[PDB]
């Protein structure tokens, strides 16, 4: 039914309008762009007195981390908006609406991620255009967009399932911040101690939370075949579980 398809598209479009309309998005964008430009200009142009050579790995990593954490907060807010306002019980009438609701949430997640990748492209492109140095590559920017898609998609579906189960908003925000920042912080201070450290360190290459969050600081994203397959499988499993629970939950 294309009527249902248009109903899905109108929901993603209005969610996008609300995001593009709120002033916090342009305040967050102003702060991140100002901070990245200030840090890059002060750090690259004076600490070793070269002939204005700038390396782009630090700006790449910093812009990736800041834009990713801001986009994550924007995504969690978008996900928990309806549960915050209590209007969700109006969208939970029949089965086809509960399903179109989940489809629209996933499509909205994809569109927001694409928009943020485009934004990341604009800041790094203007920085490179203004300065001089060795330009990056288009294939790298495309695969960076893909990494944005997988990260945001994985965490958004996980947080959507948990907020559907619990119906509490303060927990979702605190859990998202905690989950993002606890594993890179805890790993150096604890893995090197045990006689079980090598084994646990090896197992951190397979826990999706641990390696997806860990590779954020790194300036390049490199995945093995098993790692790519397990991440895609986890997103698909989350989608099936979400569909099953949404079609049996009463609001």
């Amino acid at each position: 039914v294309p009527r249902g398809s248009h109903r899905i598209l109108n929901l993603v479009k209005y969610d996008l309008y609300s995001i593009f309309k709120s002033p916090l998005t342009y305040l967050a964008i102003l702060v991140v762009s100002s901070l990245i430009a200030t840090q890059s200009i002060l750090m690259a142009n004076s600490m070793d007195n070269p002939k204005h050579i700038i390396v782009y790995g630090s700006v790449f990593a910093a812009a990736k981390w800041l834009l990713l954490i801001i986009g994550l907060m924007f995504v969690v807010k978008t996900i928990t908006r309806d549960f915050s306002q209590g209007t969700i019980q109006l969208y939970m009438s029949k089965v086809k609406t509960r399903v179109g609701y989940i489809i629209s949430k996933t499509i909205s997640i994809i569109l927001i991620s694409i928009l943020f990748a485009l934004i990341h492209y604009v800041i790094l492109i203007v920085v490179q255009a203004s300065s001089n140095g060795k330009n990056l590559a288009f294939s790298k920017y495309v695969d960076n967009l893909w990494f944005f898609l997988i990260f945001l998609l994985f965490f958004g579906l996980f947080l959507f399932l948990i907020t559907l189960a619990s119906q509490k908003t303060a927990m979702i925000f605190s859990l998202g911040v905690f989950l993002v920042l606890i594993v890179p912080f805890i790993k150096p201070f604890i893995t090197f101690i045990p006689r079980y450290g090598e084994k646990v360190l090896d197992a951190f290459d397979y826990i999706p939370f641990a390696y997806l969050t860990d590779k954020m600081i790194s300036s390049n994203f490199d995945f093995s075949n098993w790692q790519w397959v397990i991440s895609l499988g986890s997103i698909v499993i989350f989608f099936i579980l979400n569909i099953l629970y949404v079609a049996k939950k009463d609001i």
Binding site: Q85, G86, L90, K94
Partner: protein
């Protein structure tokens, strides 16, 4: 919209017990009951918010449902026109400018149609909720206590407008609310709920209304007055706590007062008035209430 053999229970307490319902040649139906008997549970069962009700609800997929439950749900941050347009696109077939303008003009929302929802009052939010519910262009429109914060004139205006809508377009209305004098204004049939069952089904279509007479006297004498009027004339209803005895319409008070004089008891207040659903409601449910 039909319900068949609905039985919903929460643990040991059972709230609804094998009910049936159908809109039979009636456009507006009122649901009347006490507090905590399961009225909102009934509306949630019809609308679709509850899946584990263990029964069968016969609704059609091509038919949309626009509803109002316990409290309005709206985007407080955004505007009224934004809310109307969003819920018209997401729930309805589209947005109609002339139709929306007609709704706004009839309801009287133009002065505050551009102001933020968080700046509204309770009556304004309730009116907006009534308009958003009718925004869906439903075939069945169901309301959970529609008149929470409105002045008498506003309630009269909204009721007149809903009647003009249910007659210009083919709509079937369910309204569950107290304040029965407002209920008798727009309703075709009333159903009475106690312990999960429909005990009574009173149907009112025309304004003949069956005029009746009220005699008020204290309880210790009320027994004798009820016995006397049942032994002479035919009596319809009694309220024991207030000492209200409602015999049929009598033009001449002479035979009643003369008999009460040789009986030596006398009334504090005697009157003749139009019968109502408020009277019917007290008749069905004072056995449980008092």
């Amino acid at each position: 919209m039909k319900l068949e053999h609905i039985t919903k229970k929460y643990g040991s307490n059972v709230v609804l017990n094998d009910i049936d319902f159908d809109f039979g040649d009636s456009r507006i139906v009122g649901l009347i009951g006490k507090n905590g008997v399961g009225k909102t549970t009934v509306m949630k069962v019809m609308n679709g918010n509850i899946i584990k009700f263990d029964g069968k609800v016969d609704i059609d997929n091509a038919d949309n449902i626009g509803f109002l439950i316990e409290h309005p749900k709206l985007y407080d941050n955004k505007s009224g026109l934004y809310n109307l347009k969003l819920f018209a696109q997401v729930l309805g077939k589209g947005f109609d400018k002339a139709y929306t303008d007609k709704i706004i003009d009839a309801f009287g929302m133009r002065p505050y149609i551009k102001k933020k929802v968080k700046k509204y009052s309770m009556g304004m939010k309730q009116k907006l909720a009534i308009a958003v519910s009718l925004m869906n262009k439903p075939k069945f429109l169901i309301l959970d206590e529609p008149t929470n914060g409105m002045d008498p004139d506003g309630s009269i205006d909204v009721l007149t407008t809903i009647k003009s809508l249910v007659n210009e377009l083919d709509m079937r209305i369910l309204i569950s609310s107290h304040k029965l004098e407002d209920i008798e204004l727009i309703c075709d049939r009333a159903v009475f709920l106690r312990d999960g069952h429909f005990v009574q089904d009173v149907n009112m279509e025309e304004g003949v209304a069956s005029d009746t007479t009220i005699v008020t006297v204290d309880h210790k004498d009320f027994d004798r007055t009820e016995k006397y009027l049942a032994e002479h004339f035919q009596l319809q209803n009694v309220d024991k706590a207030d000492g209200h005895l409602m015999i049929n319409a009598q033009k001449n008070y002479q035979v009643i007062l003369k008999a009460l004089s040789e009986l030596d008891i006398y009334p504090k207040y005697i009157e003749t008035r139009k019968s109502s659903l408020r009277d019917t409601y007290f008749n069905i449910n004072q056995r449980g209430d008092k």
